[PDB]
Design an enzyme around this catalytic site. Structure first.
Site, mmCIF file in Angstrom:
data_model
loop_
_atom_site.group_PDB
_atom_site.id
_atom_site.type_symbol
_atom_site.label_atom_id
_atom_site.label_comp_id
_atom_site.label_asym_id
_atom_site.label_seq_id
_atom_site.Cartn_x
_atom_site.Cartn_y
_atom_site.Cartn_z
ATOM 1 N N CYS A 146 30.485 61.507 71.817
ATOM 2 C CA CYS A 146 31.497 61.952 70.865
ATOM 3 C C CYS A 146 31.355 61.136 69.581
ATOM 4 O O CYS A 146 30.359 60.437 69.378
ATOM 5 C CB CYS A 146 32.892 61.865 71.488
ATOM 6 S SG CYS A 146 33.429 60.164 71.971
ATOM 7 N N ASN A 156 32.790 57.184 70.713
ATOM 8 C CA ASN A 156 32.442 56.642 72.029
ATOM 9 C C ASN A 156 33.525 55.674 72.527
ATOM 10 O O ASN A 156 33.219 54.659 73.174
ATOM 11 C CB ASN A 156 31.036 56.014 71.999
ATOM 12 C CG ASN A 156 30.500 55.636 73.382
ATOM 13 O OD1 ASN A 156 29.883 54.587 73.549
ATOM 14 N ND2 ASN A 156 30.694 56.505 74.351
ATOM 15 N N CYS A 160 36.983 57.452 73.433
ATOM 16 C CA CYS A 160 37.893 58.303 74.200
ATOM 17 C C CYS A 160 37.168 59.297 75.093
ATOM 18 O O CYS A 160 37.090 59.109 76.308
ATOM 19 C CB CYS A 160 38.848 59.042 73.245
ATOM 20 S SG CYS A 160 39.947 57.852 72.388
ATOM 21 N N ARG A 161 36.596 60.363 74.529
ATOM 22 C CA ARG A 161 36.113 61.434 75.380
ATOM 23 C C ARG A 161 34.822 61.078 76.117
ATOM 24 O O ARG A 161 34.737 61.279 77.338
ATOM 25 C CB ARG A 161 35.930 62.712 74.552
ATOM 26 C CG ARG A 161 37.244 63.290 74.067
ATOM 27 C CD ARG A 161 36.944 64.328 73.015
ATOM 28 N NE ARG A 161 36.549 63.686 71.771
ATOM 29 C CZ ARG A 161 36.215 64.326 70.668
ATOM 30 N NH1 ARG A 161 36.189 65.661 70.624
ATOM 31 N NH2 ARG A 161 35.903 63.608 69.588
ATOM 32 N N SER A 162 33.817 60.560 75.437
ATOM 33 C CA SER A 162 32.537 60.441 76.150
ATOM 34 C C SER A 162 32.565 59.338 77.214
ATOM 35 O O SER A 162 31.851 59.494 78.222
ATOM 36 C CB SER A 162 31.354 60.240 75.191
ATOM 37 O OG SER A 162 31.573 59.172 74.303
ATOM 38 N N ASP A 213 39.481 66.040 70.498
ATOM 39 C CA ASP A 213 39.777 64.627 70.312
ATOM 40 C C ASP A 213 41.229 64.319 70.678
ATOM 41 O O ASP A 213 42.152 64.845 70.046
ATOM 42 C CB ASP A 213 39.521 64.258 68.853
ATOM 43 C CG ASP A 213 39.654 62.789 68.575
ATOM 44 O OD1 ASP A 213 39.969 62.001 69.502
ATOM 45 O OD2 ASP A 213 39.420 62.428 67.402
#
EC number: 3.1.3.48
Length: 153
Positions: free
Chosen positions: A8, A11, A13-15, A125
């Protein structure tokens, strides 16, 4: 071995959630040893930083932990990973552009949500949202990661 890199923008939150979900999945299926798994960022802005505490807490709610520290994607990642799976259209655009500045791009670059059976294409996000948004991301990651392990595009 096969290899996948979750990406993301930052690097944090999401990934790191995707990475941890997928690592749990391949460990539960007893095939952790045939996989190289990582996550990285488009941007260098958050390098060195632990995941967002709300991502840690969400993963903890599901019995998962990560030691990951944010790193930026490198030109070498495009030459070594089989798959780079990213979260939203902004990520895809940036990765495809960066892909074009390397001599050899081994990696297939795809939206992780392109694997979702429930067809939610974008993993949005959550950073400006709340803990329910992190949980939506985790749930999307579970669905997409299990579809990808079954059959790649």
């Amino acid at each position: 071995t096969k290899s996948v890199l979750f990406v993301c923008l930052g690097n944090k939150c999401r990934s790191p959630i995707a990475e941890a979900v997928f690592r749990k999945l391949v460990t539960d299926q007893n095939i952790s040893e045939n996989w190289v798994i990582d996550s990285g960022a488009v941007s260098d802005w958050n390098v060195g930083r632990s995941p967002d505490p709300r991502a840690v807490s969400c993963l903890r709610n599901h019995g998962i932990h990560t030691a990951h520290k944010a790193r930026q994607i490198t030109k070498e990642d495009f030459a070594t990973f089989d798959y780079i799976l990213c979260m939203d259209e902004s990520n895809l655009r940036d990765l495809n552009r960066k892909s074009n500045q390397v001599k050899t791009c081994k990696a297939k670059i795809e939206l992780l949500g392109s694997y979702d059976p429930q067809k939610q294409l974008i993993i949005e996000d959550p950073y400006y949202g709340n803990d329910s948004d992190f949980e939506t991301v985790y749930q999307q990651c579970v669905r997409c990661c299990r579809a990808f392990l079954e059959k790649a595009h």
